[PDB]
Structure 1
Amino acid sequence: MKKAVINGEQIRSISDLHQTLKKELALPEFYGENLDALWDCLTGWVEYPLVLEWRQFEQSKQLTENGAESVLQVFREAKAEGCDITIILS
């Protein structure tokens, strides 16, 4: 079982968010750091089952513009697709 934690208050840019994901999901060394690479990693790389715990979501939204929301949507679509992903929003 893989567990990924995001401390929302520590996210100061969309770049922080993809770099926090790279580490926590053990993404490829040349992880593309975009939504397209994120989808491709969730459905063709990452280990499952997966629990993503996203703390301080609102705070992480303040300095990513639409980013935070966009990245969460990808996780949600990966879970619609059939991936065993558990999303915890706090």
Structure 2
Amino acid sequence: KAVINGEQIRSISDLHQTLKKELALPEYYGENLDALWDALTGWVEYPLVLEWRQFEQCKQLTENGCESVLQVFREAKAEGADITIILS
């Protein structure tokens, strides 16, 4: 079970570092969309539940990339990874 407290996310790099800790990603985790795909399909433990709270605050960040991160989770689920996504 992994929680992203969107109110506390200050940048896309912060988002990747939080995912790294919450999902126990490898120390070498590349903090990019290709690294995230690889970790979600060939590293993480299942069943995986990601609760992303206040995704809307990520959208307010100057950097783009919030929807792209969510999209990788959704594509990994579509690929067959046992992932559940909660947008709260």
- TM-score, normalised to structure 2's length? 0.96
What is the total number of aligned residue pairs between the two structures? 88
Whether the 8 Å CA contact 1:4–1:24 is kept in 2: the answer is: yes
Instruction: Indicate how the Cα distance of structure 1 residues 10 and 43 shifts in structure 2: closer, same or farther if over 3 A, else same.
Output: same
Secondary structure, in 3 states, of the residue corresponding to 1:66?
coil
Q: Greater shift after overlay, 71-80 or 60-69? A: 60-69
Segments of structure 2 that go 5 or more residues without pairing to the other structure are: none
- Partners of 2:42 and 2:65 lie apart in 1 by 22
**Unaligned stretches of 5+ residues in structure 1:** none
Match of 1:43 in 2: 41
Write the deviation string for residues 27-76 of structure 1: whole angstroms up to 9, x where unpaired: 00010000000000000000000110000010122116331111000000
Shift in alpha-carbon separation, 1:28–1:64, aligned structure 2, 3 A: farther
Distance 2:58 2:47 in 1: 25
Give the share of equivalent positions with the same residue, in percent. Answer: 94
TM superposition outliers: structure 1 runs of 4+ over 2 Å = none
**TM-score of the superposed pair, with normalisation by structure 1:** 0.94
